[PDB]
Amino acid sequence: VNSFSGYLKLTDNVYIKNADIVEEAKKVKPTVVVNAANVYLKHGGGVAGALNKATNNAMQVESDDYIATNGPLKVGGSCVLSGHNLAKHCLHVVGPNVNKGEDIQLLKSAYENFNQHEVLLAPLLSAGIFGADPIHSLRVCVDTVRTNVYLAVFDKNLYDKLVSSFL
Ligand SMILES: C[C@@H]1CCN(C(=O)c2ccc3c(c2)nc(CO)n3C)C[C@@H]1C(=O)O
């Protein structure tokens, strides 16, 4: 039993809700919140900009030190950093950005990072400003993640389309 509330159950391990992931995180304080990161951990917009703003830019400060030490992430890769005031940890995961010409096939590799954590709050990878079909993202998520994932879809209209179309 966990403290997530109001989710619709899609499969044995995947759940989905119309929610602002920032507000879900502040309420639940999950062990892991997933960020829709880029390889530079430049949290400018989308979910990343929103999460970082909620941390008063502490996420960006920590991220800049991470990059200075380690260099950029791989597309499809991830790193674990602090969750600041939102969660114990933030798993920064790089889904491919279709608006950069990045291979959509790497989306499965991106979701595989979720399997290293028993429970996560997460957005649909490569959706929103990353330019991929959020319906496809949900499909890859369900077919790749085996751990317990609580998916927040900010846009109510998209959420209804995701649920109604889910096979
Ligand atoms: C699936 C699709 C992809 C990208 N995406 C975002 O970039 C995103 C997420 C949360 C955000 C946000 C932008 N802007 C704010 C305002 O502070 N918040 C709380 C989520 C979006 C969705 O779930 O509808």
Side-chain angles (χ1 to χ4, degrees), residues 32-132:
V32 178
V33 66
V34 173
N35 186 28
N38 58 51
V39 297
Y40 307 110
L41 303 179
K42 288 306 182 194
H43 309 303
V47 173
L51 292 171
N52 176 57
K53 179 180 173 180
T55 76
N56 185 40
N57 210 52
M59 177 180 286
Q60 191 64 67
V61 170
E62 177 194 32
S63 293
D64 286 353
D65 171 82
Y66 174 92
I67 296 286
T69 297
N70 300 109
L73 295 181
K74 299 171 178 177
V75 179
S78 71
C79 67
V80 179
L81 291 174
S82 178
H84 301 277
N85 53 318
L86 303 176
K88 188 168 190 289
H89 304 286
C90 178
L91 181 69
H92 296 272
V93 180
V94 185
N97 188 325
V98 179
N99 302 318
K100 298 180 181 177
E102 296 170 348
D103 189 5
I104 193 63
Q105 303 303 309
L106 290 165
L107 186 53
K108 188 172 184 75
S109 302
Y111 276 117
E112 287 171 343
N113 295 286
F114 289 27
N115 290 322
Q116 301 293 317
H117 304 276
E118 287 198 328
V119 178
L120 315 87
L121 174 62
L124 288 169
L125 297 179
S126 297
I129 69 174
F130 278 60

